[PDB]
Amino acid sequence: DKICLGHHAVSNGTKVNTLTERGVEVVNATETVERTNIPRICSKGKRTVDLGQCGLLGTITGPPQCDQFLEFSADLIIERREGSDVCYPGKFVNEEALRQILRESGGIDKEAMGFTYSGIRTNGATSACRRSGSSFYAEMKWLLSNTDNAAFPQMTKSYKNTRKSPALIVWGIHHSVSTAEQTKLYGSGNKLVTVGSSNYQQSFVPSPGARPQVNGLSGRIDFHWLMLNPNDTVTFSFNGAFIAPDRASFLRGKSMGIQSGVQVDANCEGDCYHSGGTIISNLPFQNIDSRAVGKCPRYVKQRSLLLATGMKNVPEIP
Amino acid sequence: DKICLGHHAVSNGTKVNTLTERGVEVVNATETVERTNIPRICSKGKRTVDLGQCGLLGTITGPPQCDQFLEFSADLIIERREGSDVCYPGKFVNEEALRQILRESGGIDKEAMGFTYSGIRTNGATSACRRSGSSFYAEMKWLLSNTDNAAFPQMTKSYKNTRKSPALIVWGIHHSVSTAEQTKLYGSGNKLVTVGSSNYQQSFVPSPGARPQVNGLSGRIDFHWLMLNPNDTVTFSFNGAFIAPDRASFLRGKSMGIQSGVQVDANCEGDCYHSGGTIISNLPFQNIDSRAVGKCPRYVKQRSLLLATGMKNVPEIP
Amino acid sequence: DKICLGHHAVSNGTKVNTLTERGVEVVNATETVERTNIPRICSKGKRTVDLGQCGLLGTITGPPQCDQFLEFSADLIIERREGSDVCYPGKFVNEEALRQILRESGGIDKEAMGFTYSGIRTNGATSACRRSGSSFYAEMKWLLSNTDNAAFPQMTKSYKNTRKSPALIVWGIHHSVSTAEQTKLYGSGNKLVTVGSSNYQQSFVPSPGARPQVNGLSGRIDFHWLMLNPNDTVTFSFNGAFIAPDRASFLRGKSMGIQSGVQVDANCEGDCYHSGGTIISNLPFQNIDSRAVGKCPRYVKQRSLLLATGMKNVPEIP
Amino acid sequence: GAIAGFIENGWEGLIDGWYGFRHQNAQGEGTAADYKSTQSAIDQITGKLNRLIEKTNQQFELIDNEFNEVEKQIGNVINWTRDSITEVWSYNAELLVAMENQHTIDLADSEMDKLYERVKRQLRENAEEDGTGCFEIFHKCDDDCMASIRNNTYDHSKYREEAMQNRIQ
Amino acid sequence: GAIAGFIENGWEGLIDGWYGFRHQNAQGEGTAADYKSTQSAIDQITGKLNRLIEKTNQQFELIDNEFNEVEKQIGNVINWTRDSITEVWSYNAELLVAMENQHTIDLADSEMDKLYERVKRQLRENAEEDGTGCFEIFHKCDDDCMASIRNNTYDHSKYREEAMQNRIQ
Amino acid sequence: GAIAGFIENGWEGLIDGWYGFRHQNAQGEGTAADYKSTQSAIDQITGKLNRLIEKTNQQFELIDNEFNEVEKQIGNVINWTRDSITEVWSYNAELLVAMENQHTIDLADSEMDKLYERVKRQLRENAEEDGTGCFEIFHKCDDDCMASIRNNTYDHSKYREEAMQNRIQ
Ligand SMILES: CC(=O)N[C@@H]1[C@@H](O[C@@H]2O[C@H](CO)[C@@H](O[C@@H]3O[C@H](CO)[C@H](O)[C@H](O[C@]4(C(=O)O)C[C@H](O)[C@@H](NC(C)=O)[C@H]([C@H](O)[C@H](O)CO)O4)[C@H]3O)[C@H](O)[C@H]2NC(C)=O)[C@@H](O)[C@@H](CO)O[C@H]1O
Ligand SMILES: CC(=O)N[C@@H]1[C@@H](O[C@@H]2O[C@H](CO)[C@@H](O[C@@H]3O[C@H](CO)[C@H](O)[C@H](O[C@]4(C(=O)O)C[C@H](O)[C@@H](NC(C)=O)[C@H]([C@H](O)[C@H](O)CO)O4)[C@H]3O)[C@H](O)[C@H]2NC(C)=O)[C@@H](O)[C@@H](CO)O[C@H]1O
Ligand SMILES: CC(=O)N[C@@H]1[C@@H](O[C@@H]2O[C@H](CO)[C@@H](O[C@@H]3O[C@H](CO)[C@H](O)[C@H](O[C@]4(C(=O)O)C[C@H](O)[C@@H](NC(C)=O)[C@H]([C@H](O)[C@H](O)CO)O4)[C@H]3O)[C@H](O)[C@H]2NC(C)=O)[C@@H](O)[C@@H](CO)O[C@H]1O
Ligand SMILES: *[C@@H]1O[C@H](CO)[C@@H](O[C@@H]2O[C@H](CO)[C@@H](O)[C@H](O)[C@H]2NC(C)=O)[C@H](O)[C@H]1NC(C)=O
Ligand SMILES: *[C@@H]1O[C@H](CO)[C@@H](O[C@@H]2O[C@H](CO)[C@@H](O)[C@H](O)[C@H]2NC(C)=O)[C@H](O)[C@H]1NC(C)=O
Ligand SMILES: *[C@@H]1O[C@H](CO)[C@@H](O[C@@H]2O[C@H](CO)[C@@H](O)[C@H](O)[C@H]2NC(C)=O)[C@H](O)[C@H]1NC(C)=O
Ligand SMILES: *[C@@H]1O[C@H](CO)[C@@H](O)[C@H](O)[C@H]1NC(C)=O
Ligand SMILES: *[C@@H]1O[C@H](CO)[C@@H](O)[C@H](O)[C@H]1NC(C)=O
Ligand SMILES: *[C@@H]1O[C@H](CO)[C@@H](O)[C@H](O)[C@H]1NC(C)=O
């Protein structure tokens, strides 16, 4: 007698948005914006190092905290907030650029630069770098005059990179607490450090003066760095206040660095990270962290954007 | 006998664009790109300061022009082109970064740093900073030797921030017109200024030499600044050519800074600003200024994009 | 008896993508992503200079390589990889910013700054700048003491820009291979160079020391530059290690600079360039080079995006 | 001296609604607007309008200076970035409007069709399409009968005998 | 006690498909789902879903630091850039979803119409539209006949005499 | 040995137009193209094409260097920005094309339907839909009559008696 055409419906309708309507009910919808966070660092498949109290830049110079990571190798690199690049108070020049380089280095390979010295002390040590007793950066040499107040001989040291990769060279300038202390270490008169390459040229002067005490010290050691091209040479000319490198650094390969405050997990597999954990999602967007890194869904301001996966829901006439 | 279905139409049709057609007439359309400008600064509801001839950075150091704004408070901050940060010729290092900080500071609170001095003059003044007679920056102290050509004593001054907010500290280096003039002020020999924190370390040397005359002066005073973290300390070591701070600065809260060339209006209420006035519009886009700031519709290159608010217009058969 | 309505179709259907389907066949489609490259620089209509072995910054200072381009004029400017800004080993400070300025300068107009000198040699020359015999930068003057080891007189030179355009002023600081060599040239004692404007202020010190040999030389000449506003003045105060300018530079008009490694073609007309050639296309996108410059289609990651230019293709029932 | 529907013109006299009816009978010619179709169309268009008024909570501040120009390199980087996003929004704006206008026009065409189809299903076997968007009614339909169609109270059962008779010889 | 089609409700009992048939005859009332229309709809929606799962191969790394804050100027430039692109993606996301949902709803409405239109062309001159999305069948259609319509094996030639007879007086 | 319409295939022989007619009578089988529907479709597609050819007036210049690499920090900031906008345009391009192709296909389907619906309204009560997109004509329609349908000069009044007679017994 009669045949009717129809479509299914529910009493359990879910609202979505369109070009025209706001809150139009459809039969079924799904979320496009990921909000589910895994408060761990899913490190399965990736060789991972947790620097802990070692700052990433410290792996190059070598304070006590970084003694394990002097030649580390990794696919994933994690920096911790408690980390520190420094024992004797100081900071890197162009620090962030260098960090970014080391974050994707794959780790570092160290190699002796082979500097040799004559009428000069090299055993410069401090209480801030305790290792059994007083000590200093593992990869560096704190050069002094010889006895006390004695003149520091003008020196010239050079290093050639005989490898097919750029060499990371680092050196420090020491700022004594006073011109008195500077003289006691390197002798009277003005002091100059010039660093020349075929692509780099800079000059440095020490700056004795009272600073606030950090780690019980008012002195500052500031670090400088350059990348040395293959077959290129660096030459160091100096007469005091110079922190010499003992080894150069070579990047191992490819990696990725993050800054996290949550534990590492080796069972879960991930590819998108932020400071609070791992984002694992096939969803196109996320509202967790705008600074998330790796292979991630795009960050959006919205916490939810429902995509209709069903027709417009129309309740049945009772 | 007959019933017809139809739709309305006009002889007054307006053209829009679609995916396929260019200039298809619809019954009614509206503009999406705002072009209506209000050549005023709608400041109703917002505490507003018009710096006029005072440069924003001048509020910190305190030339005559900024004497009213030494501890100003605002929700909205306006810089004028005639403004100047300087009486005695000079400029800030990292000036723009500092401006951006002050633009959203909410104003500044000043507090004595409490530096005290001995065998030294502090009444350094100049003709370029006239205030009744010759004078100097209100927040700074031009330190000299004592009589003339006399030696400037090595000094060390420190300040600790006992507040829960970062302190804006500023100091200047004076570059005399000649080594002759430098000696007359601070004495013979080389001069050094070192500024140390727990997060900052720098060093400075004066640079005597002939410059072009600005405000009748060939000398230059250059200013340096840092933010001092809570509970942290700054130490100043110097022996001449040093412009000392008398007070530190503390940011009051939250604000927004603009650069305008039009009058201020206190009756109109606004939230989007540019150099030529206030943009008040519910429209999603604007073609007024790409550098407009605040809460604004997005800038676009097009002067007009008509959105159809009615059906396709079809003229009636005569 | 019967009439049927239909649409055309092909056996030669081409797949495209939509919102729902991947690989839906339509009758006819066209490409939106350009991939066809012209490995030439289509320079028709544009005045073009191929700097070759002359570096763009060299056109200002004037090594032998750039002698033809000392006052060049162009609409399109091409840098070559073999190019060099330098004869005597050195580099510009803020080099890239300056390059970007010269790339859209339209070429340069040179004008004597009219510096005159007294008890001093100006004929400083080197083997690295060979021109018939030993020589130096064409636009610069290597100033020396007079005989050998003799004292270099304190000097002050100033230049005023009497034109309605900013003047490009350049000067160099010479870093000798040793303090011995520095003394032989400019005399004993410390050396200072101060450069003052009404908008610029800087200071410079030489830095004698051993560098690696470039062009047989271990010395470095570093160049500094500023733009001098109309009616403004620059003043140079120095006592040695100063490479003085002989002429100033004025930008001719408007242009565009590229870095290419392929030949120039004067018959073809183009507007989008990259290092590998000219992109001539009405297509909205391209997958050739992300750093392409000029008036270009937007770069995309995809090599192909087919746009349906025909209906859905439905094969005829056999 | 006939009347015509949407299939070959609009009505410049329909000034109290977007869609409507135009009839003619012994009582003469008349024109009224349909509420449900007109309101639906208006609801959707205003819906688009509200969807574009929804302001952004993102506040943006100065990163350069038009009194004291910033350093050249960082300045060109800033300008390059700004012009790039300006290109993006200009694209977005152009496409958004073009896309919406295409939809506004189509959904209006849909409403017209739905109205026409509705009336057709009302008249059942008592009328035929004349091709101009009108229905030839094969019985007598006075003003009362015409109003019955407009408010969906028309019962085709009442006129089916008279109608089917006239449609066949 | 009648039954109704899509033109004035959905069917909360249709739990084995998106689209379907509901009939009533001497054997009673029944409801089955149509495969071809349902599958088409499901194929298109899943097609959208796959199109949004397609991950990006672009890897992004840190350009700032939340332990040691970068220099102010370059920091504000970075934040200004990030927030700008965040605005763009937030816009894109919002519009994409809104655009797709508009399409998902419409293409579902299309499928419903295509199904209704198909059945109509099957029944030829043997049925009339009742206005609710149903067809009054003017001959006897048992369960077997009803199944014949659902699987497109109904031959209107078989019932045309009986049907045309009943439609006219 | 029958002929069929759009509802179950296209015509690889229709080589002089996008849409068309295929008839069969005593004079035999024939195929011609419809101008108005074909032109409309072509006008809209070319309209899209022009809308994408409209070049941009934005000129972009170098902000980095592939001979002398810039400073690392500002370099990574630049690369991060460029790759970000590259992601945006790649998204935009992909979506634009996908969106347009969806529309191109649909508007073509619309034109086909509008053509079919037009012919239906021409034939009035003189024909029936066969289900394949064709119309069974219930009177004699020679080549002249067939041409009259294609150019909209067919008057159903001329054949209505003969047609209604054959449709009923
Ligand atoms: C600077 C200041 O605050 N003003 C003083 C007050 O503070 C003292 O300052 C002195 C001077 O710096 C501090 O002396 C330093 O103390 C360290 C322990 O905290 C440590 O003993 C330092 O010696 C070593 C070291 O152990 O690291 C010894 C190493 O062998 C040295 N290595 C080399 C290669 O020389 C090395 C160097 O001597 C310096 O580190 C190079 O920069 O360090 C030692 O110098 C003292 O700790 C501070 N004490 C306090 C309580 O602040 C007060 O003394 C005050 C008293 O009147 O006087 C102010 O002027
Ligand atoms: C530099 C130059 O152009 N070359 C000169 C010519 O120009 C004169 O230069 C002198 C030297 O700078 C100028 O002297 C200065 O004039 C000021 C007025 O224009 C003013 O009088 C300066 O004195 C004060 C001051 O009033 O500000 C006095 C303050 O008490 C001082 N405060 C302190 C704490 O010392 C202060 C200092 O002396 C300096 O400002 C510190 O930098 O400033 C005064 O020094 C003179 O104005 C210039 N005049 C002209 C016409 O250019 C010519 O004199 C030329 C004549 O042969 O010689 C060139 O070498
Ligand atoms: C520095 C170094 O590697 N250590 C040396 C070794 O290397 C030699 O260094 C000397 C010192 O620099 C080199 O002398 C220079 O050689 C040039 C040719 O290669 C050239 O002859 C330089 O002289 C001129 C020049 O021609 O350019 C002469 C110009 O007239 C000068 N102009 C002015 C205005 O003064 C100019 C200046 O003298 C300087 O360029 C200013 O910077 O340059 C000349 O100085 C020598 O070439 C190097 N040779 C080699 C083989 O490396 C060895 O000599 C080694 C031997 O024991 O000793 C190391 O200490
Ligand atoms: C409601 O929508 C969700 C999302 O599309 C559907 O859940 C999917 O089911 C399929 C098959 O079981 C899976 O492949 C997907 O991974 C599921 N997605 C999610 C987010 O869970 C669900 O089937 C829909 N509801 C109904 C009744 O079909
Ligand atoms: C033509 O379009 C404009 C824009 O939508 C309509 O004007 C709107 O009218 C409503 C109600 O009166 C207001 O809420 C809006 O603020 C108005 N917008 C603007 C931009 O003025 C106008 O009504 C439309 N024309 C007709 C005849 O309806
Ligand atoms: C298939 O699509 C292409 C692209 O639209 C058509 O080629 C165009 O033809 C017109 C007129 O001849 C030209 O103005 C365009 O420049 C052509 N475009 C390209 C990319 O060549 C082609 O006509 C289409 N195929 C058919 C059979 O019409
Ligand atoms: C940035 O763009 C503005 C607007 O054209 C221009 O005036 C300014 O010079 C640009 N900045 C730099 C550093 O070139
Ligand atoms: C960048 O944005 C973050 C997030 O709000 C903020 O904490 C940081 O201070 C910003 N950077 C600078 C330099 O202001
Ligand atoms: C910018 O990207 C290019 C292309 O991959 C790369 O070669 C270059 O090293 C990058 N710049 C920096 C500073 O890393």
Nearest to F155 by CA among F121, F120, F122, F129: F122
| Cβ atoms B256, B104 nearer than 8 A | yes
**Any bridge partners for residue D29, and if so which?**
D24
The maximal CA–CA distance of chain F, rounded, in angstroms, is 92
Residue A21 at interface with chain D, using a CB cutoff of 8 Å: yes
The C-alpha atoms of residue B267 and residue A250 are separated, in whole angstroms, by: 65
Backbone φ and ψ for E168, nearest 5 degrees, come out as -110, 105
Element (H, E) at D117: helix D72-123
| Cβ atoms E121, F129 nearer than 8 A | yes
Query: Does residue B63 share a domain with residue B146?
Result: yes
Query: Does residue C247 share a domain with residue C270?
Result: no
Cβ distance D48 to A19 less than 8 Å, yes or no, reads: yes
The C-alpha atoms of residue A175 and residue D39 are separated, in whole angstroms, by: 80
Q: Estimate to the nearest angstrom the gap between the alpha carbon of A229 and the chain centroid.
A: 22
Residue that is last in its domain, among A232, A262, A292: A262
| Cβ atoms A113, A245 nearer than 8 A | yes
Q: By what method was this entry solved?
A: X-ray
Which residues, 6+ apart, have CB-to-CB distance to A191 below 8 Å? A152, A182, A205, A206, A238, A239, A240, A241
SS3 (DSSP) at B286: strand
Whether E76 is in the pocket of ligand 8, judged by its Cβ within 6 Å, is yes
CATH number for position C293: 2.10.77.10
Architecture field, domain E1-169: Alpha-Beta Complex (3.90)
Element (H, E) at C248: strand C247-251
SS3 (DSSP) at C244: strand
SS (H, E, C) chain F: CCCCCHHHCCECCCCCCCEEEEEEECCEEEEEECHHHHHHHHHHHHHHHHHHHCCCCCCECCCCCCCCCCCHHHHHHHHHHHHHHHHHHHHHHHHHHHHHHHHHHHHHHHHHHHHHHHHHHHHCCCEEECCCCEEEECCCCCHHHHHHHHCCCCCHHHCHHHHHHHHCC
| Cβ atoms A164, A250 nearer than 8 A | no
SS3 (DSSP) at E24: strand
Resolution of the experimental model, in Å, one decimal: 2.8
**Chains linked to F by 3 or more Cβ pairs within 8 Å:** A, B, C, D, E
Question: Which two tokens mark A102?
Answer: 């080391």
The C-alpha atoms of residue F61 and residue F78 are separated, in whole angstroms, by: 13
| Cβ contacts of A24 on chain E, cutoff 8 Å | 101, 105
Q: Which domain holds residue C31?
A: 1-46+263-318
SS (H, E, C) chain A: CEEEEEEECCCCCEEEECCCCEEEEECCEEECEECCCECCEEECCCCEEECCCECCCHHHHCCHHHCCCCCCECCEEEECCCCECCCCCCCECCHHHHHHHHHCCCEEEEEECCCCCCCCECECCEEEEEECEEECCCCEEECECCCCCCCCCCEEEEEECCCCCCEEEEEEEEECCCHHHHHHHHCCCCCCEEEECCCCEEEECCCCCCCCCECCECCEEEEEEEEECCCCEEEEEECCCEEEECEEEEECCCCEEEECCCCEECCCECCEEECCEECCCCCCEECCCCCCEECCCEECCCCCCEEECCCECCCCCC
- The one-character DSSP state at C216 is T
Taking each helix axis from N to C end, the angle separating D72-123 and F72-123, rounded to the nearest 10 degrees, works out to 20
Q: CA torsion, points F85, E89, B302, B258, in degrees to nearest 10?
A: -90
The number of beta carbons lying within 10 Å of the beta carbon of residue D149 is 20
Binding residues of C for Ca(2+), as ranges, are 71, 109-110
β-strand pairing of A22-26 with A29-31: unpaired
Residues across chain D: 169
Nearest to A134 by CA among A121, A125, A143, A123: A125
Taking each helix axis from N to C end, the angle separating D143-150 and D72-123, rounded to the nearest 10 degrees, works out to 140
Cβ distance C19 to F17 less than 8 Å, yes or no, reads: no
The C-alpha atoms of residue B59 and residue B138 are separated, in whole angstroms, by: 10
β-strand pairing of C277-278 with C298-299: unpaired
Which residues, 6+ apart, have CB-to-CB distance to E113 below 8 Å? none
Question: Which two tokens mark E82?
Answer: 């990030």
Taking each helix axis from N to C end, the angle separating F72-123 and F35-53, rounded to the nearest 10 degrees, works out to 170
User: Which residue in chain F has the smallest CA separation from D169?
Assistant: F161
Q: How many helices (H) and strands (E) does chain B have?
A: 3, 28
The C-alpha atoms of residue C170 and residue B171 are separated, in whole angstroms, by: 30
Is A254 annotated in a binding site? The answer is no
| Cβ contacts of F81 on chain E, cutoff 8 Å | 81
Best probe residue, ligand 2, of B120, B127, B173 (max atoms within 8 Å of C-beta): B127
Cβ distance B4 to D23 less than 8 Å, yes or no, reads: yes
The C-alpha atoms of residue C162 and residue C158 are separated, in whole angstroms, by: 13
Chain D interface disruption, residue of C57, C100, C225, C251, most D CBs within 10 A? C100
Which residues, 6+ apart, have CB-to-CB distance to B305 below 8 Å? B31, B32, B33, B285, D93, D94, D97
Query: Does residue A224 share a domain with residue A147?
Result: yes
DSSP string across C94-137: THHHHHHHHHTS-BEEEEE-----SSSB-B--EEEEEESEEE--
Question: Which two tokens mark C204?
Answer: 């410079």
CA–centroid distance, C81 to ligand 9, in Å, is 17
Query: Does residue B168 share a domain with residue B56?
Result: yes
Please identify which residue in the block is written with the tokens 């040479």: A233
Query: Does residue A137 share a domain with residue A29?
Result: no
Q: CA torsion, points F61, F65, F71, F74, in degrees to nearest 10?
A: 30
| Cβ atoms F18, F109 nearer than 8 A | no
Question: Which two tokens mark C245?
Answer: 């300018």
Query: Does residue C39 share a domain with residue C173?
Result: no
Question: Which two tokens mark B34?
Answer: 């705002």
The C-alpha atoms of residue E62 and residue C203 are separated, in whole angstroms, by: 35
* Cα dist from C195 to C169, D40, F49, whole Å: 11, 74, 59
DSSP string across C46-61: S-EEE-TTB-TTHHHH
The C-alpha atoms of residue B80 and residue B76 are separated, in whole angstroms, by: 13
| Cβ atoms B145, B242 nearer than 8 A | no
Q: Estimate to the nearest angstrom the gap between the alpha carbon of E161 and the chain centroid.
A: 36
Q: Which atom of ligand 1 is nearest to the CA of A210?
A: 1
Whether A30 is in the pocket of ligand 4, judged by its Cβ within 6 Å, is yes
Q: Residue A151 is which amino acid?
A: A
The number of beta carbons lying within 10 Å of the beta carbon of residue A221 is 25
Sheet holding D127-129, edge to edge: D28-33, D19-25, B2-7, D134-137, D127-129
The C-alpha atoms of residue D70 and residue D63 are separated, in whole angstroms, by: 9
CA–centroid distance, B236 to ligand 8, in Å, is 29
Question: Which two tokens mark A136?
Answer: 């200093």
DSSP string across B168-183: EEEEEEEE-SSHHHHH
Ligand nearest, relative to CA of residue B9: 5
CA–centroid distance, D43 to ligand 5, in Å, is 13
Domain ranges for chain E: 1-169
Element (H, E) at D103: helix D72-123
Nearest to A46 by CA among A231, A260, A267: A267
Total number of domains in chain A: 2
Query: Does residue B74 share a domain with residue B210?
Result: yes
Environment class of F28 (CB within 10 Å of its CB; exposed 0-12, middle 13-18, buried 19+): exposed
Å between B97 CA and nearest CA of chain E: 5
Please identify which residue in the block is written with the tokens 């107009």: C109
Radius of gyration of chain F (CA): 27
| Cβ atoms A240, A185 nearer than 8 A | yes
Residue D131 at interface with chain F, using a CB cutoff of 8 Å: yes
Taking each helix axis from N to C end, the angle separating B95-103 and E72-123, rounded to the nearest 10 degrees, works out to 60
Chain C interface disruption, residue of D68, D73, D80, D84, most C CBs within 10 A? D73
Query: Does residue A161 share a domain with residue A15?
Result: no
Nearest to D92 by CA among D52, D60, D50: D52
The number of beta carbons lying within 10 Å of the beta carbon of residue C7 is 30
The C-alpha atoms of residue C112 and residue E168 are separated, in whole angstroms, by: 109
What is the distance in angstroms between the CA of the first residue and the CA of the last residue of chain C?
A: 22
Please identify which residue in the block is written with the tokens 């005639």: B82
Radius of gyration of chain A (CA): 29
CA–centroid distance, E17 to ligand 4, in Å, is 14
Q: B94 — alpha (psi -120 to 50), left (phi > 0) or beta? A: left
Q: Estimate to the nearest angstrom the gap between the alpha carbon of C50 and the chain centroid.
A: 12
Residue that is last in its domain, among C262, C280, C296: C262
* Cα dist from B32 to B171, B277, D96, E84, whole Å: 50, 20, 10, 20
Q: Estimate to the nearest angstrom the gap between the alpha carbon of A285 and the chain centroid.
A: 27
Q: Which atom of ligand 3 is nearest to the CA of C128?
A: 27
Radius of gyration of chain B (CA): 29
Whether C36 is in the pocket of ligand 6, judged by its Cβ within 6 Å, is no
Which residues, 6+ apart, have CB-to-CB distance to D46 below 8 Å? none
DSSP string across B114-131: ----SSSB-B--EEEEEE
Long-range contacts of the stretch F107-113 (C-beta < 8 A, 24+): F107/B20, F107/F41, F107/F44, F108/C7, F108/C310, F108/C311, F108/C312, F108/F18, F108/F41, F109/C311, F109/C312, F111/F18, F111/F19, F111/F37, F111/F40, F111/F41, F112/C5, F112/C7, F112/C311, F112/F6, F112/F19, F112/F37
- The one-character DSSP state at C65 is G
Cβ distance E89 to F84 less than 8 Å, yes or no, reads: no
Long-range contacts of the stretch B113-120 (C-beta < 8 A, 24+): B113/B159, B113/B169, B113/B245, B113/B246, B113/B247, B113/B248, B114/B159, B115/B141, B115/B157, B115/B159, B115/B244, B115/B245, B115/B246, B117/B143, B117/B155, B118/B153, B119/B146, B119/B153, B120/B144, B120/B145, B120/B146, B120/B152, B120/B153, B120/B155
CA atoms within 13 A on the CB side of E44: 22
Which residues, 6+ apart, have CB-to-CB distance to C124 below 8 Å? C136, C141, C142, C143, C144
Whether C28 is in the pocket of ligand 6, judged by its Cβ within 6 Å, is yes
- The one-character DSSP state at C161 is -
The C-alpha atoms of residue E12 and residue E14 are separated, in whole angstroms, by: 6
Which residues, 6+ apart, have CB-to-CB distance to E120 below 8 Å? E127, E129, E135
Å between C203 CA and nearest CA of chain B: 6
Residue A290 at interface with chain F, using a CB cutoff of 8 Å: no
